[PDB]
Amino acid sequence: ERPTFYRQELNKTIWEVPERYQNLSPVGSGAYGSVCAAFDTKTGLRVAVKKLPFQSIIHAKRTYRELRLLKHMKHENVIGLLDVFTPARSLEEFNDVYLVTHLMGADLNNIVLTDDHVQFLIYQILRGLKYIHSADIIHRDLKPSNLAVNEDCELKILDFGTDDEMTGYVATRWYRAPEIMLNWMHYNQTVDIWSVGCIMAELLTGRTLFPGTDHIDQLKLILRLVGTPGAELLKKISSESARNYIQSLTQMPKMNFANVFIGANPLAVDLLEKMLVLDSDKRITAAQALAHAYFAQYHDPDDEPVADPYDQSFESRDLLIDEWKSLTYDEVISFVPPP
Template identity: 55%
Template sequence: MSKRVRPGYYRQEVNKTTWEVPDRYRDLRQVGTGAYGTVCSAVDSRTSTKVAIKKLYRPFQTELFAKRAYRELRLLKHMKHENVIGLLDVFTADLSLDRFHDFYLVMPYMGTDLGKLMKLQRLSEEKIQYLVYQMLKGLKVKNSLKTHNRESDFNCSVDEINILDFGLARQADSEMTGYVVTRWYRAPEVILSWMHYTQTVDIWSVGCIMAEMLQGKPLFKGSDHLDQLTEIMKITGTPTQEFISKLESDDAKSYIKSLPKVEKKDLQKVFSTANPQAVCVLECMLLLDPECRVTAAEALSLPYFSEFRETEEETEAQPYDHSLDNTDLPLDQWKRHTFTEILSFKPVLPESKETSL
C-alpha cells in the first residue's frame, strides 16, 4: 500500500520518478537530469512565475551523498545576491525525521539562455556591457565565498552557482550535474587538466561568452578536446616556455612542445568592428596562463563597464560558516542537520524586477 500524501501536497510521476510537491507548484515538466538529481520546471501559482525544482537522487544513500546534499542546501541558503541564483524554497513531503528520505530545492527558472537570445537578435553594445557586468558581479560574489571557505575540494559544491547557473550560457553537457560548461567555453586548463584550477577558470568562460556576443558566433568551436586547444591557440598563440614549465602534467608539456609555433593574434584586428574598450576586456580574459587573467573584481574596474559601475552593489558574499563541511559525520547526523536546515528556511519574497532583455 502506497503511503498517504502529506496534506497540501500532491504526487506525480515524472519520467518514472515520483515527485511529491506542494499544491502551489503546478505543471511539472522535466528539463534536465544528471548524476545527482533531476530538475523540473513548474509554475508557482502563488507568484505566477516559472521556477526550477531540483529533486536530489537518493540524497541519503551514503554518508558522502548526505554530506553533499547538506552542503548544497547550506550554500544555496547562504547565497543571497541578485547575480547568483538563490534558493526560493526548499521542502520535503516527509513529516518527520525518521521518515525523511527526499527533499526538493526551488530556484528561479532561467528559461531564456544567452544562446537563444543571440539567435533572436544581435545584442546591442549597451546590452553586452550590462550582461557581462552582471556576470562579473556574480562571479565576484562566488569567488569571495570560495576565498572565505578556503577549501581545496570546494569546487564540488560550487557547481550550483556557476556562470551557467546565471542563466547566461548555452546547452549544457549531460555529464555530471547537467550544468557543466560545454567544450567551446571551457578554459584550456580544464580541457587537458593542465594544472590546479584558480578563480580565473570562470573568467575564461565569460571571455568566450562576451566574444560570442560581439561576433554573433562562438569564438572557439573545436570538434574535440585537441581541436578545441588548436582553435584556442590560433588566437592566443602557442604557450611560452615559462608557461609550459608551470604545467603539472608531463604529457601536457610534451604535447604542447610538439605543436607548431603560432603567434598571438591582435584581438583589436580580430574584433575590428567592436568597441576597443570591449576588446581590452577580452585581452585581459582570454589568456592561456590563468595567473595572468584578470579576476572578476579587476575586470569590473575596466573602463568598458564604467557607466554601469555601482561599487556599493559589487558586494562580496558574507563569510560562510563551514564548520561542518570538513567533518565526517554518521549518516543520521547529516540527515538531522539537513532536516533542521529545511525547517529553518525563510523564503525571501522576490521583488518584481523586470530585466530589459
C-alpha cells in the same frame, strides 16, 4: 507551522508539495533535472521547483553540498533559495529534498545583441561572479546554458560549485579554461573568467569562440588565438605529461584581437584580451573587470556586493551516508525564507 502537502504525478515520480505551490508543470525536458515550473501563491512569484539523494556517500555529500551552496547565495545575479522543503515529518522518513527558486525566462543560448546588450549581460555575470568568488566558491562550468534572464534581461547564474559528455564537438567543453580541460594544475577562480571571455566573444560575434571537435582540436584553436605558452607558464603546469605534450607543439604568437573581433567596441576587445590570457595567474579578476571602462555606464562600486563568509570545511570531511543525511536534514529544518 508545517504546511499541508498534496500529491501529484509529474516526472514519473510522485511530487508532494505544499499547497502554496500551484500549477506545477515540467520544464526544460530533462535538461535541468527533475524541475517543475509553478506559481507560488504566497509570494506571487513564478518559481522553479527541483526534486532531487542519499543513495551513496558521494550522492549524500553532493546533496548536502548543493543545499549549502544554494542556502548561502543571496545576490541579484545568482540563483538563490526561495524555499526548501520535505514532506517528511522526521529524520527517519526523510528521503526527498525539494528546492525552490525564481522561474527565469530563457538561458543565454536562447538569446544569442547590440554592444549595449552585451555590456549589460556581461556586467551582470561579472557582478554575480565577484559575489561568488568572494566566498571562495568557483563555478567551474560557466556556459550560456547556466546563465538565465527574465524579460528585462536581468541575469542570474545557475549551477555553481562524465568523460563521455565532455567528448567531441560539444558545448559542454567549449567554455572550459585549458588548464581545467587538460588537467594542467590545481586551478583558481579565474577559470570562470576564461568562461566569461568565451561567452562575451560569442555574444559579440554570434559564433562559438573555440568550437573544438575534441580536447586537442580545442586546445589548438585556443593556442592559435592566445599563443603557445612561454617558459614561465610551462613551469606552472605541474602535470609533467601535459607539459611534455605542450612543448611538442610548433610555437605560435598571440593573434591581434582587433583582427579577430572585427568592428567590435575597442574597449570590448581590450577586456577580452585581459580575460583570455593563457596563464591563469595573470587573468583579470571579476572585481577588476567590473572597473574596466567597458562597463562605465553600469559600474557602481557601492552596488556590487560581496558574500558573507562561507564555511566549506565539510569538503575535506569524510562521513557516513546517515551523517550527511542528518546534516542535510538540519539545513532543511533551519531554513529561513528571504525578506
